[PDB]
Amino acid sequence: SHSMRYFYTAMSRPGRGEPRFIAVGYVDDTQFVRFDSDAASPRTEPRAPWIEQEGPEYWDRNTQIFKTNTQTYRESLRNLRGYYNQSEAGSHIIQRMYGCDLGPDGRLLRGHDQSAYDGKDYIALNEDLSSWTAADTAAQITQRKWEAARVAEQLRAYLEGLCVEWLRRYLENGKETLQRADPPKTHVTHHPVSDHEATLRCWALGFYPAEITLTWQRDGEDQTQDTELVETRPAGDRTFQKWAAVVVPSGEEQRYTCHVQHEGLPKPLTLRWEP
Amino acid sequence: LPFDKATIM
């Protein structure tokens, strides 16, 4: 299913003026906007070609929202420092991720809103979009403030309305790229590590979206405990790369098979070292 | 389009 996400990072910096606020937006695995408060006149900027179609009023509307967030996160950072009895000399970070998952239809399938403090879960909106899960008692002070302000109700109206409507508009405006799955270009390489053991590397390249399954099989048995899997990485052209490796004793190269699962593939692939 | 209501933590 298609999704839209906004990622916020608010960081205090005791000896560099006031807190820095950064926002990035994504439609699936494609980034389309950015904002960074670290400028004299900060402005929202396009990051995908299909969003340049939006007029000046769209950019001003976004800028106004992210300027509100800069101010709001400055106070939240100060408040969280008080909950944890932290010194004003230390630098802290609040992160937030929110957004919608679209169904096969144009319906909200799942809504999200999660916050973190110093890299750990802080407060998250539950699946019902009407209640919260707080990580500790500091987060329960935030929860009490958010229940009194009815933040869960505001989010539910956003997630069920504007979030899915704007995601659908973006998917239509960028359909040639956003609604096209690029299947991986696959191949298996061979690398001797010693005289009687060689590594077999299964490659998946130029694929979009990032979601992929790469598995090695010794005669058809999941070699999951012995497989080296690298984290999916961006190619830099909006496509992704990944590889799965196995240390194989010299002679049993034809014994091992690589299995590739991706939405761009009509049927899952089965590969082996050739020749 | 981002959410335009923000509440201090």
């Epitope: 709001t72 009815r150 956003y158 504007l162 | 209501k5 509440t7 201090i8």
Partner: T-cell receptor, first 117, second 115 residues
Framework: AVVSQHPSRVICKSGTSVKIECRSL??????MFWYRQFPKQSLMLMAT?????????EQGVEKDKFLINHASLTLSTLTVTSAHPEDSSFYIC?????????????FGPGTRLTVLE | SAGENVEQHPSTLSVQEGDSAVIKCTYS??????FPWYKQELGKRPQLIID?????GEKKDQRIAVTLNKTAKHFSLHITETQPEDSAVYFC????????????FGKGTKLSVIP
């Protein structure tokens, strides 16, 4: 999530300056709204008080007459300078815990200002 | 706010005790997703009585209810089995429009519940 005002009633001679406070009693507010009500009971927005920024005045509001100061995250003041009998009215503020596109607003009790020659 | 205008119908309403009272509001902007209703008794502050958001068609709280038609851009307040204590000025609002953030209020409905 109450909002309060002080004073609640003012009787003053013409030419005096009258300062009115708007306080969020149990929440922090980045924005407060100042209204004026006459016998024709509609709520006339005068100005929006902004924390760390100058006030946003509505069309037809004598700026130099009504000074708005966002003092902190809980207090906003309205000052009616050199008050004259025509300035007599019911001044009421509102504030809410949500910033950005306005959400639930809680009104103060109002201030009845009576200016006499 | 620049693109939002809220209109309250009727401006004055007299109802007989025990009868129902309906106040309808219309709005113009698509960025409106929050719709509150305030009750103001003479010389007192407007008090929030009920509100509704764009993802809900109807909300009910005992004798009071609010309904929303987001396609036609109108919302209504329904008071059932009216009591003389319901006599007040009622205001509706919307949060839409561009520019400076604010609630856009209707000009009010003076409701008179005849005992």
């Amino acid at each position: 999530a109450v909002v309060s005002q002080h004073p609640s009633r003012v009787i003053c001679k013409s030419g005096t300056s009258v300062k009115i406070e708007c306080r969020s009693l149990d929440f922090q507010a980045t924005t407060m709204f100042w209204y004026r009500q006459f016998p024709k009971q509609s709520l006339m927005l005068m100005a929006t008080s902004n924390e760390g920024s100058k006030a946003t005045y509505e069309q037809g509001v004598e700026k130099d007459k009504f000074l708005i100061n966002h003092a902190s995250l809980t207090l906003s003041t309205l000052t009616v300078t050199s008050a004259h009998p025509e300035d007599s009215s019911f001044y009421i503020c509102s504030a809410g815990p949500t910033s950005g596109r306005t959400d639930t607003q809680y009104f103060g009790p109002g201030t009845r200002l009576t200016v006499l020659e | 706010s620049a693109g939002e205008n809220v209109e309250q119908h009727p401006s004055t309403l007299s109802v007989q005790e025990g009868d129902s009272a309906v106040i309808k509001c219309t709005y113009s902007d698509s960025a409106s997703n929050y719709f509150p209703w305030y009750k103001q008794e003479l010389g007192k502050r407007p008090q929030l009585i009920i509100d509704i958001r764009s993802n809900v068609g109807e909300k009910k709280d005992q004798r009071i209810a609010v309904t929303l038609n987001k396609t036609a851009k109108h919302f209504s307040l329904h008071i059932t089995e009216t009591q003389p204590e319901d006599s007040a000025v009622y205001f509706c609002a919307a949060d839409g429009g561009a520019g400076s953030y604010q609630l856009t209020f209707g000009k009010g409905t003076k409701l008179s519940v005849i005992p």
